[PDB]
Paper text:
The ribosome is an RNA-protein molecular machine that coordinates the vital process of protein synthesis in all living organisms.
A small number of particles could be separated into a class mostly corresponding to the 50S subunit with a miniscule proportion of 70S particles within it that could not be eliminated entirely. This class of 12,449 particles was used to reconstruct a Bbu 50S subunit structure at a resolution of 3.4 Å. The protein densities corresponding to the full-length uL30 and bL38 proteins were found unaltered in the 50S subunit structure, confirming that both these proteins are stable components of the 50S subunit. A surprising finding in this 50S subunit structure was that the long and usually well-resolved 23S RNA helix H68 was not even partially ordered. A lowering of the density threshold values shows some ordering of H68 but only with simultaneous appearance of the fragmented 30S subunit densities, suggesting that this ordering may be attributable to the small number of 70S particles in this class, which could not be computationally removed. One explanation for the H68 disorder is that the 70S sucrose gradient fraction has some not-fully-assembled 50S population. Another explanation is that this 50S population is formed through splitting of a small 70S sub-population. With such larger motions, the H68 helix could therefore play a role in completing the dissociation of the two Bbu ribosomal subunits.
Numbering used by the authors:
A (entry chain D): 1 to 277
B (entry chain f): 1 to 50
Write the structure that this text describes.
RNA sequence: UAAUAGAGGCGAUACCAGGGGAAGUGAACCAUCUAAGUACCCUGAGGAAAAGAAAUCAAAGAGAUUCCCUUAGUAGUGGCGA
RNA sequence: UUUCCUGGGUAAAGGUCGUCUUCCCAGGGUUAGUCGGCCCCUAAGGCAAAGCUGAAAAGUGUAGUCGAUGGGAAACGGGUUAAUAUUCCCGUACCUCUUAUAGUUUCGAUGGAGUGACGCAUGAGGUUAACUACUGCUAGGCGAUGGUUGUCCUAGUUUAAGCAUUAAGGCGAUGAUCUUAAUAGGAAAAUCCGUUAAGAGAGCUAAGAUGUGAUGAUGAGUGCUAUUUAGGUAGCAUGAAAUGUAGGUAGUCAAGGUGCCAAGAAAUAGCUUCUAAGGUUAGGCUAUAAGGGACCGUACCGCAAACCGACACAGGUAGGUGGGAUGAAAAUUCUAAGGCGCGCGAGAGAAUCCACGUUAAGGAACUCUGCAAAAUACGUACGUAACUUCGGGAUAAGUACGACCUAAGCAAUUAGGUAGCAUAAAAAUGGUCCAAACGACUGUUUACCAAAAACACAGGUCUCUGCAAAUCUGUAAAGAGAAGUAUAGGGACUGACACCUGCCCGGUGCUAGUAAACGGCUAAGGUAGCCGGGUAAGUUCCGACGAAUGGUGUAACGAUUU
RNA sequence: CGUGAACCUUUACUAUAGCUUGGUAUUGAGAUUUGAUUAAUUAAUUAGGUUUCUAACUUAUAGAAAUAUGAGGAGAGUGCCAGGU
């Protein structure tokens, strides 16, 4: 992968770095039969209010129909056609062309190249890119795109540069260390993809200026001490207060250390040891 | 100075037209009230503007 | 899908029944209470509606329901304060 | 929404007058297959049977259906009326179909697929309206006053769509049309699966150019009758006067090409094609002849006395045309066509108010303050420090030249001669340097007394959340988050970058611990760091509280303060 | 100044959204010993602790629904009562 830096010809370029797209089959337009135009979200919901703040108008982008659920294509080999840039997620997307003529997108793992043959199912070889139920993957491998309920698709780790570590297997369950670091039990019949996700320099980037942050669809963040007490519990800044109060969210919920996970959730059985600060 | 009444027409008819009034409960109450008072103009649709 | 039958909405800036139900006040504050089931909202029909032929009133011997005159500002209730 | 045209009139209204008006009265005026809608499609969005959730009223929401500023069949020129025209008329094209004729064969769906189908920045190159450079060529003048029948002057020399011809350039031979084998497509298909064995295949797109359209029309002018302010003007006739070269703007070729990452609408329309149930002139295609155009808007104002500001108001007001000279340019100024001379005027110019022009000597002594003015300004050259993140600072500072004629020179410019007080001769077109404070810098906000040191910001840190996530709005459903997945999301804090960011767990938060928590410095007492000069004369300024509500420096930056 | 009004803040007072705990209905069948109580270690009840099977119930896929399959589980969720915030 790589990082491309810029000479400081303006005061904004001094700390701008972007990725280098050398590990990408470039010059590419998405497959017309898999992408549809879409709005930009900006965080408003059906009622029309703002439910998540500070999300705004970025660059217009199309949606690429990914496939995290390769189950209905077991035993059928496919060919890697190209590795493409996806604006809707960090990771890159590979275009698989199946032997029966159907084409699909998947998350591009780390180290695959055009022309590779990929296979899914219990009988598939243990090779980067193959999707197999957790039964069959040997202890000690690194997988990604983990399915949580049979038939749902990959709902676990998916972002650029991530991977999960298989630790142990027992009964109906497999112990998996997720990228946040907790150890969680997974039902042994769900599928997963072998190998890490490529594009691991995605977060070593220094954005460089407020404009690019606006391109990424991120409106400005207004602190709480810049508010008035009607606007935010922290307001009242007659000469730079610090809130005069233990830190809280704009709705009064504590924020420095308060644990917001429900105390009696349904999945508590399947969490061995939570993540670490 | 650009000011308060930039006069569109699609906005006028859509927002204040007879069908927009009938479309909900409060609009029908408006219509009943104006009929009772005996207004010569019930809605903005009496100004024939599309 | 077919067959008929009954409804849609308006009218009464009136009345009745059911559901929802404040606030301005008084208590020289107010929080109980009061205002008050008031305004208003909503669902129903009628020409009246509702209710209506006692597992009742009540210590008198009466005998469905409703509306008046009296009982009576009485019996009680009320931060026993209003 | 008649304000448009014709005629008549002046109660009011027009900031005056009025014979006039957007005033009043009467009459008249808007002709569509090719324009804009309607229509067939969809963006955001709205409604929405069913399902689900709620005292009611409804709220969510799938299948669907509506929803243009978008995408889809077709036309241009000229003339005519007191006012209307790509709508009427003249001349000349094109697209849809109803029926029938004759060459005829697989048509048929709201279904499947392709096409439809898209970014930004940015040269360069191919032609070109308008426009001027020159010449022919027409028409008129040939000039009260020196010269002017000829290197004279003035004006014009025009003309589309469409059709026919061809083809700059781009994409192409890495495959763009096609001809068959296999078929895990969901209706199943002789199309699409573009996935694979072959091996026959270079064309596609395309401005522009020429002819035709067009001995047509238009036409400066010239010719008759009327009018007349003695100036031209109402009808009315007639008239290629080069469809010349050179230069070339703005499109356009071009949804091109070349690079970059922020990776840049959908379509159930249109075009193309495919098959089921059903059909085998029942249809469809390739032609010809005939006729079928829906319904509505069509006047006028539309940078303004006709729109929006109570007004006939110094305002706002979308988009396409944007002449000529100077110039790099749409700057500045002048001017053509065209449109106007602001809807109270006329005499006198007292003081004074307001907006400007000029100045002896002095040059910030005025004043809270070099406020306001003044001045600097361009092009081509010379020459440019400290400091620094090595990018900048920087147009640093500072200095020279600019006319005209001749000659040289591609041109910039050089040389000579000559002219002036001035020679980037008008206008437009930076004042600079030094020091300090704060903020990194672009930017944003107090509509209507604050444009800032505030906010935003890149960056960094802490904490929460394993996905029917946390979180937010709701009694809920449900939605957002998210058709996302810890290299992620949410919140708090700090604010580029550089050196540092220490001590304290008593109290209060959070799960005995945690201070990059609220906070303090007995629980622990704060670690690092933070007179001289200037002026004759200086309460100003410059040099000798407190560490993530941050401490101390810092290039560059600033309608900031001194 | 008025036993004015409104807004804001808090370790002012009093309610309450929301959050959280317990009990109960939804909610069944097993196994086991932790006990208390009642009489004679035994017997009859009952709170629990550690576990189990799925038919209630709810998650994933297909479906308009029905229904089926794969996993959880009498837990959770939702009412009512009570205890905290």
């Amino acid at each position: 992968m790589g990082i491309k830096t810029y000479k400081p010809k303006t005061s904004s370029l001094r700390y701008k770095t972007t990725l280098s797209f050398d590990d990408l089959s470039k010059g590419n337009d998405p497959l017309k039969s898999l992408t549809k135009g879409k709005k930009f979200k900006s965080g408003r919901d059906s009622s029309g209010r703002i439910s998540i703040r500070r999300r705004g108008g970025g660059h217009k982008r199309k949606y690429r129909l990914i496939d995290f659920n390769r189950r209905d294509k077991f035993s059928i080999p496919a060919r890697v056609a190209s590795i493409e840039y996806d604006p809707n997620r960090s990771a890159n997307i590979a275009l698989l062309v199946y032997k029966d003529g159907e084409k699909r997108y998947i998350i591009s793992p780390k180290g695959i190249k055009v022309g590779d043959v990929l296979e899914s199912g219990p009988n598939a070889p243990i090779k980067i890119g193959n999707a197999l139920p957790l039964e069959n993957i040997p202890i000690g491998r690194t997988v990604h795109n983990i399915e949580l309920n049979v038939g749902k698709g990959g709902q676990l780790i998916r972002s650029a540069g991530g991977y999960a570590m298989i630790l142990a297997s027992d009964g109906n369950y497999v112990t998996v260390k997720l990228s946040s670091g907790e150890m969680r039990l997974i039902f042994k019949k769900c599928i997963a993809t072998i190998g890490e996700i490529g594009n691991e320099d995605y977060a070593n980037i220094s954005i460089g200026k407020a404009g690019k942050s606006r391109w990424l669809g991120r409106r400005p963040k207004v602190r709480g001490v810049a508010m008035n007490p009607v606007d935010h519990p922290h307001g009242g800044g007659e000469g730079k207060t610090s809130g005069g109060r233990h830190p809280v969210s704009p709705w009064g919920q504590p924020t420095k250390g308060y644990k917001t996970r429900k105390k009696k959730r349904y999945s508590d059985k399947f969490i061995i040891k939570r993540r670490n600060k | 100075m650009k000011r308060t009444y930039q006069p569109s027409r699609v906005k006028r008819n859509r927002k204040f037209g007879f069908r927009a009034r009938m479309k909900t409960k409060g609009g029908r109450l408006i219509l009943s009230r104006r009929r009772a008072k005996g207004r010569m103009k019930l809605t903005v649709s009496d100004e024939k503007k599309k």
